[PDB]
Design a protein around this nucleic acid. Structure first.
Ligand code: ZN
Ligand code: ZN
Length: 75
DNA sequence: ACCGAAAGTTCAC
DNA sequence: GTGAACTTTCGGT
């Protein structure tokens, strides 16, 4: 939806469940094949590339979604 | 060879 | 100025 163009999907999770970041032809967990639980060791960046930033909150604080040149309220 | 995930980037409000 | 959204490339299976 906000992340990927898929209305049913929300952008969180993945087809394989080995990640979280997805907004294109990556892995929309619609049907899936059942794989989540506690499956650790998954390299995904859900948030912005900024190490100091965590992705929460914006520079103006009027929004929350930021993962590029939008609004990191920190380093 | 095919499928999935991620980077960097770009358009609209 | 800020937020929000797309295409393409690389890596893994
Ligand atoms: Zn999706
Ligand atoms: Zn950040």
């Amino acid at each position: 939806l906000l992340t990927c163009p898929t209305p049913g999907c929300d952008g969180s999770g993945h087809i394989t469940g080995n990640y979280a970041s997805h907004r294109s032809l990556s892995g929309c967990p619609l049907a899936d094949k059942s794989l989540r639980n506690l499956m650790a060791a998954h390299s995904a960046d859900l948030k912005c590339p900024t190490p100091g930033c965590d992705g929460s909150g914006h520079i103006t604080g009027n929004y929350a979604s930021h993962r590029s040149l939008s609004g990191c309220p920190r380093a």
